[model samples]
Target: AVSKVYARSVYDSRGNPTVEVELTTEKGVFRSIVPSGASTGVHEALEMRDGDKSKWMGKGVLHAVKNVNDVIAPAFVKANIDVSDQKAVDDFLISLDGTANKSKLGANAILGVSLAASRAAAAEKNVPLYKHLADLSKSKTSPYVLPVPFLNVLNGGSHAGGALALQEFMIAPTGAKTFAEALRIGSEVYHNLKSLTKKRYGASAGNVGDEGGVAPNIQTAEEALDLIVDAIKAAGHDGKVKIGLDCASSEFFKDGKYDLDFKNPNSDKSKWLTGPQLADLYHSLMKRYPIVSIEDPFAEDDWEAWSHFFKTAGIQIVADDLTVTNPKRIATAIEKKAADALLLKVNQIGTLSESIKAAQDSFAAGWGVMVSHRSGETEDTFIADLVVGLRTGQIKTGAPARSERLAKLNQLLRIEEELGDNAVFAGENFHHGDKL
Candidate 1:
């Protein structure tokens, strides 16, 4: 039995307003805070900003909050759906919106209620949040394992004020036996990277960017990867850590070419690289470095480019821009053989159940899942439990620094401690986590 459903506006990590919800089930109250992204997908669900300049420079989520209070809250209570029935609750939420992409009620509005409802379900079921989520997925919940954390060590493109065109450069500590050990390895490597940046690029280059990675004045991908490799070796994690890249190539894709220097206003069209040329750059990077995963290697609509790269690449090809966590987009990616991994983002689809469905479908299609955090995130550590609950072999929150990013990793450490010997670190099996 439900007692109350309340919503309010709160600030995200970026200091912009977002939606927050508190749902009371019987006695205990559960709360959820929705997250936002900096480089959003073209067709993902709407976030429902106020569009008025006065409040938070038109970044206010007050309208989304009102939608939760005025429309979703009352109807949800009257419908009398069970809190544990995640699918039913999400279906009702979608029905209320009656629009594709959750545009009518706003995804932020629906997600606040959806997530809080999940929290309440856990309280009512007398289960840990991750276990409750496992039940929701209807997957094999017996053997739970900690995911290999893919920690971003460098920021570029849209995430940083740097010259590098690639968005994110990360390292995965897959050689560690436990999650705590993985954290230690990442922390050491991160400091080494910081020290190297200060020595070579200058002190200001060592300054952390939005996701807590340094934003050096570096212009090339190799320049960035060299730093990562040197740092790993310096920290004595040379063999344990592997590299990952989130190209987010759509940020610089222009006029059917990849502009490596797109940040410059005087970037020349003659300098733009074609799709095949860009693929060769990645292929060369993989041959020289331990690059195990690449995300959005091509532009979102450049299916031919992705399919071509997938044929030759032995590592995981993650589709974030292409799939956007939408079922239809994911299916298209599968049919075209564009990607082998699904980059799971809960806010992209706007409901916990739908997000789970996306993962289930991706897993069914033999795709590895990597739970991720947006560039603009929040203090909430829901995604931490998310990767554990779903048993996704890998997660990318950001650098090992920043409270918003560290909060997730810290929760993983707690979960592993609670699991004791039962905990299995994904390690080398970061690609296929469910079987381990």
Candidate 2:
């Protein structure tokens, strides 16, 4: 039986207040901390916060905390903690909210409690978090593969001071035989990138952005990619590292056109391109560099552009803002053949069940899944277990510089150690290719 529920205000990695929920049952107590996103999508579930401008600059989650203590706690009292149907519990919470987008209880409060309940159940069952999640999802594969890490090494757009327009540039160590070796390869390249940036742009080039990626004074996106490729070669892992980009096109998109402000400190001259022109630009760059993945190449609402890009892009095309981890949107994308992959962010859907369903639908449609972290993150490592449990075979945690980002990678290392010989690295499968 559910015996107690509690919530408190806590600080995220960005030092912003958020909700942390605790659920107690007959077996033990389990807690979960909610994470917030800086570059959130418009279609994402609403995270409730106090509107009072006097506190925390209107970002205070005190109202979410109260929702947990007063509303959610009373509803779940005496509820079976070990309920076999995880969906039932989560759906009941949704029903209690009685609104679309979880506007009533706040996704922050509801998700915290829902995840805590799942953790409490897992503790009572004496199973690891991954096993518990796998059982809930009824996943077809064994929960042993350590996902390939897409280490974000450079930041731009909203994630950094707008020196460049691209959001993230990452390196995937695709040649490593094991998870630990891949992490080491990525870390070496990351350090090499810092050294290379500092040598070329001076000490300030080593400064980090929101996700701990280097915010260098590069002139263009091409320059940043070239520097990363050089860093890979310098780390003695040139062929081993492949590039991935989170273009986050919506940020620079306006009036049906994409802007490349060459007048900006990072650009040589301003240029504007329509959707097809931008897609062609990406095609040319992919041919130039060893690019393996491209995410959000078009704005969220540009369905035709996404379709056009997906048809010709030989590499993986990932949908983030386009899907928002929502099943309806994912299904719509699958119907239209919009993208080849989906970026799974748990909080984007507001509940674990919904997020799992989205992944299931993606897999059913032959699309790959890349479990991801937000620019604004926390030390909580729930996502690491989630990737393993679902066997997503891909992760996009930030660089190995900050503790918040390292927490997820470190947990993956621990999981690999725990599995010993059973641990399998995703390798080329992470890129949806049979071999490199």
Candidate 3:
């Protein structure tokens, strides 16, 4: 049982304030930190703040910290450490908040303690976090594999203030035999990309965005895709590396129409296209490039468009804003046969249990699951272990240059080393149309 709980304010990689929780039990002290997002979903749980406009640009999380110390700490004081029954503890926190969106206590606050308490129980059991998470996820008997890395090597939209409208363009290194080998391949390609960008565009073109991907003077998404293809050949990983995109199309969608006009306060390029036109654009790109996955290709609320793209895309159609890690939304998608995969983020659902529930439900429906990182991230590597534990098959933690992005990959490297021969990399299984 947890005996004491404490929380404090900490700064994320973006210098924004977040919460960190510490849980003390008879076995040990377990700590976990929560992450924040930049391009958040409209249905995501609320992140509580003091609303004091003067402090931290009114993003101060002191209110969440206090809730952890004063409110949540008291509730879990004597509760048994049911590491497997994460839903019970998470439900208690939700009921305590007494809000539909966890706005009263903050999803950041509740998730901090929920994750820490679970880790505390795992520590008490003397098991790895991955194993404990597997037990909690009810997949203890499932085979474990190191997920294929969805390395974000180019950023736009909210993550980058550039002419590009898409949010992320990634390199999926699916040919590596091991996790470390995949990282090596990705790093090589990244460096090659930097060199190519500097040589083609100006030296300033090599400058990185929020996620460490090169932010160049590329005028169009096609230009970005061509650059990635050239970089793959430059690195001698041509067939091994595939392309992925996080379109975050909601950022470009307005008034029931898809807009391709690259809207930036700094640019005059206005591109507009209807939903079918946008889908056709993707179709042309996929035929020309080795594209494997596309996320949020349409607006979150546009079910017809999503289904249309999913049917014709011929690749993995992932749901980020569409599902937001909500079980109900995921079930609705399953009923509608909308998305082929889900992007899992713990804070999206307010608690560890809820995130697991989302993943579990997706798995039951034979949909692929990927644990991903937020644009405004911290060094917290919980999701690294999470992907391994849940055997989610795929992960996206941004490019390899920034420490915050590398931290998760570095942890996975260590986990693979520890698992030794038992470590299996999720190779082609991560691809679409495979036995997911």
Candidate 4:
């Protein structure tokens, strides 16, 4: 094993210095690495010295950056982009942001950007970008978004071959009376949904889950509500765990109803829930548990529906796919009363500074902030630390055995273990730091 010191630098489009990191490593020549300075996505691109190592054993965000500029960049030039101009490197990223329609690009765009950036940077240095990033992937991060088993109930499955697998948790009789009851019910719903999807279509391999599909399910709002209620109850809640709604913007556009009445899958059994679904979901849950935060609830672009949810829910109506958690979108959400809470994502905006700005502004507006994770993730612990350092607290990282998710879970466990009695895992997967 050998210990070596390295430095890295980051530049913006105009060749402006953005951030830097200094790395110190031992053992594997390709140990996971992250930038040494403050960063946006994954806190810092990771590095793997050897093969596909699952765990991150590196420095913090700061050192990660420094390593990238000094060590990673040179390696990248040797293997990838083959140029040393930082401006060109920045341009490649900027090109993606614009070509992908600036803000419209979803999860794929983010993943692409991260991958491309690493590639370009490495190419400029003539080293394999993935190897470079992998070597740096272990930058020290506290991690955010602790994964609770409950989240998996929402998203988990194979590809097109499965119908029953599509729905992990049912929403038949949405809204449970107590948290404990809700948790118990949730388990049943998950099992039912899983069976339904699989039994119906014979689950496929490509049906791997993705991110932010809290809506667009072939299921209706009422059905969703019922399932959520049961799940919450089953989770051992005394009705204290609240229920909320998140309807994808695309889901609303598909109905052609032009309104918020997301017809229940089994509307014949019960009247379909409509625009007031959020308020209804809230009130219903409040009656049973202390229902608080609701997200989306309606189309993303519809500020009016958002205001309605905000007014009635009174707890916290949050923004999800709406604007993909971008700061500008958050501004609109706050201005239009679209939501009482803003979901903060580093990749959504692409950088640590931007994420902080969004969180700070939302925090200033007295709105809650939730740092989220996408489906495609690595074990970089940036989000974990963000939750801890920024005190943002809430994180939404749904299920899967992926390193990205576990990275966060492991990071959180460490934090709690470190915090000792100072911290307790906040139950509701989407509550705010302020509530604690």
Clash number for each model: 0, 3, 2, 123
- The digit string of per-residue lDDT tens for model 3 on 159-237 reads 8777888889999898887889989999999999999999998898889988889988676789999999999999999
| Segments of candidate 2 deviating more than 4 angstroms | 81-84, 141-143, 262-270, 432-436
Residue 255's C-alpha lDDT in candidate 1?
90
Write down the lDDT of every candidate, Cα atoms only: 0.90, 0.85, 0.84, 0.43
Report the Cα lDDT for candidate 3: 0.84
| Candidate that would win on lDDT | 1
Estimate the TM-score for candidate 2.
Answer: 0.96
Question: Model 2 Cα displacement at 241 (Å)?
Answer: 0.6
Q: Candidate 4, residues 1-436: lDDT per residue as tens digits?
A: 1133233333322222223222222222222222211112221222212122332322112333433444444543343432233234334444434543233222222332243344334544555332243233321123322222223434322211122222222121124422223334544544454444444435542143443122224333345445555444544443443443333433433332332332333323233334565446546655654345455556556566667767756576667656555677777877787777776666555433445566767877878776666444544555665565555545555432344455665565565556544444434533454434
- lDDT for model 1 comes to 0.90
lDDT at 385 for candidate 1?
Answer: 83
Worst lDDT run of 10 residues, candidate 3, spans 262-271
lDDT of 4 at 15: 24
TM-score, one value per model? 0.98, 0.96, 0.96, 0.54
lDDT of candidate 1 over 1-436, digit per residue (tens): 7778889988887799888899988958899888898886697888899999997999998889899888888998889999899998999999999999899999999988888888899998898889888899875665687999999989996788878889899999999888999999999999999999999999999998788998999998999999999999999988899999999998888899988888786988878888899989998999999999999999889999999989999999999989999898999999999989999999999999989999999999999999988887888889988898999879999999889899999999999999877778889999999766
